[PDB]
Design a protein around this nucleic acid. Structure first.
Ligand SMILES: Nc1ncnc2c1ncn2[C@@H]1O[C@H](COP(=O)(O)OP(=O)(O)NP(=O)(O)O)[C@@H](O)[C@H]1O
Ligand SMILES: [Mg+2]
Length: 516
DNA sequence: TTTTTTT
């Protein structure tokens, strides 16, 4: 092994665990020439990895890559070309101002388009297909919503989009009911734990994260082409939070002839990983677009403000249903908590924040919310802070023993010593030790895990202290979680900033590959 | 600099 490492130390730049950054300091602290070609070629790989990590790009034009090397390194804009070029021919980077990718990402994008291709050209079957829509099946649905039921007939891949609150996820209960009546096995999942949880609620069925559906293991996902996921119909919600990699993994596990229904809105939150497949799919596959808003009552300021965010314009606060109260990070959380009390308490208003840490982060908001509505008796320590009877808790990690999965809300029944017994939707259970780090207080929530949920009145904390997270989709997503009233706490300028900042488009050739 | 998933 280290024969490889003595020849080139920057062999870890793309190795498990450690990355370029670490191997770089371990290279400078032990001699190492910042201009050394072995460091440059590695620096180029790091540039692309970072391109996907920070901006979600699947590739970078040769130029932007050389430029990215200069910013994440520091050599001469001429040496960079040699860095990229060396990495290219060394096979550390692939090309196709060619488009350069991390080798596996090009393969990934090519196999993904391929999978989508066959999904779009093959008929659903087991040549076995009795999909038929009984009238009772479109009961309660709108014309547009019902059309999805018809579309799944004769098509293996169907996309269901529409802005927030148009009843996409709701349409899903009907689709699943139909499927079951036809004797088909239905699998339900979403990218985040809480979203999967809500998909389950509105569907009346068991749903999980895309990771648990595929059976995540040490060797990777259990389900794939050799052992497809056991479902005839696959329903995936909140698909805009799915990156290329996960999408590839899910599609590759779809039983041949089986159906896949993707539902989501690209105007909401983009994936944390690279890519944004839903954008391509919503244009290549048969899609039905819902347009009637049901979440908020017709002509509620919220709806108009949401339309404003899509055009870089902040909300016109003032209304009893759309207001903002200025606050600073200093003594901010305390204020937010008092605003909550003034609104009926934690149970009458959901608090949302863009980040977990910081004076206005989820962790500190929780503390003040806990201190204000459930003051007292030093209970059992958990993820952050402690839990005391009466506290609302959120499962954040999967617990197979008791079968409490990421995204489940619970109520602390009692905290005795180091034994925290909680009630997770009827499933009363006792937690001790390690399993205590599987949950956090649930008074405050991040916007990312809020996607897919709705509440009557929402209180979103948005302020300059959230700078890195001030994007248009983020606030559009936060604002639209509200059914009746949306109050904001922070600064009006934060919203102006957020509305004007649309994260840059993600370099992707998925659509091109599907069509070409 | 930050968001998620993870037997
Ligand atoms: N056809 C309908 N008629 C009346 N109410 C409906 C209808 N469809 C959905 N709703 C209600 O609208 C709200 C649900 O919207 P939902 O199905 O979550 O839309 P969505 O597009 O999934 N929103 P989102 O996930 O944020 O993009 C609930 O009050 C549903 O009961
Ligand atoms: Mg939904």
């Amino acid at each position: 092994a280290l024969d490889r490492l003595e020849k080139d130390l920057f062999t870890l730049t793309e190795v498990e665990g450690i990355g370029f950054l670490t191997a770089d300091k371990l290279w400078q602290a032990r001699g190492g020439a910042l201009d050394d070609p072995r460091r440059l070629t590695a620096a180029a790989v790091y540039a692309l990895q970072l391109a996907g990590t920070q901006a979600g790009h699947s590739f970078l034009p040769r130029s932007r890559a050389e430029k990215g090397v200069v910013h994440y390194t520091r050599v001469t804009p001429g040496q960079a070309r040699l860095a990229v070029e060396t990495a290219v021919e060394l096979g550390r980077l692939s090309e196709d101002e060619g488009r350069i990718y991390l080798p596996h990402v090009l393969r990934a994008e090519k196999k993904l388009a391929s999978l989508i291709r066959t999904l779009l050209a093959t008929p659903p079957a087991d040549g076995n297909d009795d999909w038929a829509v009984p009238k009772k099946a479109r009961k309660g649905l709108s014309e547009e919503q019902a059309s999805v039921l018809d579309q799944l007939a004769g098509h293996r891949l169907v996309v269901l989009t529409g802005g927030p609150g148009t009843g996409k996820s709701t349409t899903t209960k009907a689709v699943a009911d139909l499927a079951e009546s036809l004797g088909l096995e239905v699998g339900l999942c979403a990218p985040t734990g809480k979203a999967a949880r809500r998909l389950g609620e509105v569907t009346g069925r068991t749903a999980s994260t895309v990771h648990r559906l595929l059976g995540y293991g040490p060797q990777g996902f259990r389900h794939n082409h050799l052992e497809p996921a056991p479902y005839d119909l696959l329903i995936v919600d909140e698909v805009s939070m799915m990156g290329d990699a996960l999408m590839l993994s899910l599609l590759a596990a779809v039983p041949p002839g089986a159906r896949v229904l993707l539902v989501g809105d690209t105007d909401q939150l983009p994936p944390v990983d690279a890519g944004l497949p839903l954008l391509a799919l919503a244009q290549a596959a048969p899609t039905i677009k819902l347009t009637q808003v049901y979440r908020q009552a017709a002509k509620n300021p919220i709806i108009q403000a949401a339309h404003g965010l899509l055009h870089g314009e902040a909300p016109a606060w003032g209304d009893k249903r759309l207001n903002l109260t200025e606050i600073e990070p200093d003594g901010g959380a305390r204020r937010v908590a008092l605003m909550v009390r003034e609104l009926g308490g934690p149970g009458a208003v959901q608090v949302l924040t863009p980040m977990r840490k910081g004076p206005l982060g989820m962790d500190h908001l929780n503390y003040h919310l806990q201190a204000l509505f459930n003051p007292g008796e030093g209970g059992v320590r958990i993820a952050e802070g402690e839990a005391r009877p009466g506290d609302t808790v959120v499962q954040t990690k999967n617990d197979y023993n008791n079968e409490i999965f990421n995204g489940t809300l619970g109520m602390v029944l009692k905290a005795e010593g180091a034994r925290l017994t909680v009630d997770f939707d009827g499933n009363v259970v006792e937690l001790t030790g390690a399993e205590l780090f599987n949950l956090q207080l649930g008074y405050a929530l991040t916007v990312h895990r809020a996607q897919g949920s709705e509440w009557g009145t929402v209180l979103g904390v948005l302020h300059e202290a959230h700078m890195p997270m001030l994007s248009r989709n983020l606030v559009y997503t936060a604002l639209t979680r509200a059914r009746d009233r949306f109050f904001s706490a922070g600064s009006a300028s934060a919203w102006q900033i957020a509305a004007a900042r649309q994260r840059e488009a993600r370099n992707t050739a998925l659509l091109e590959r599907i069509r070409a």
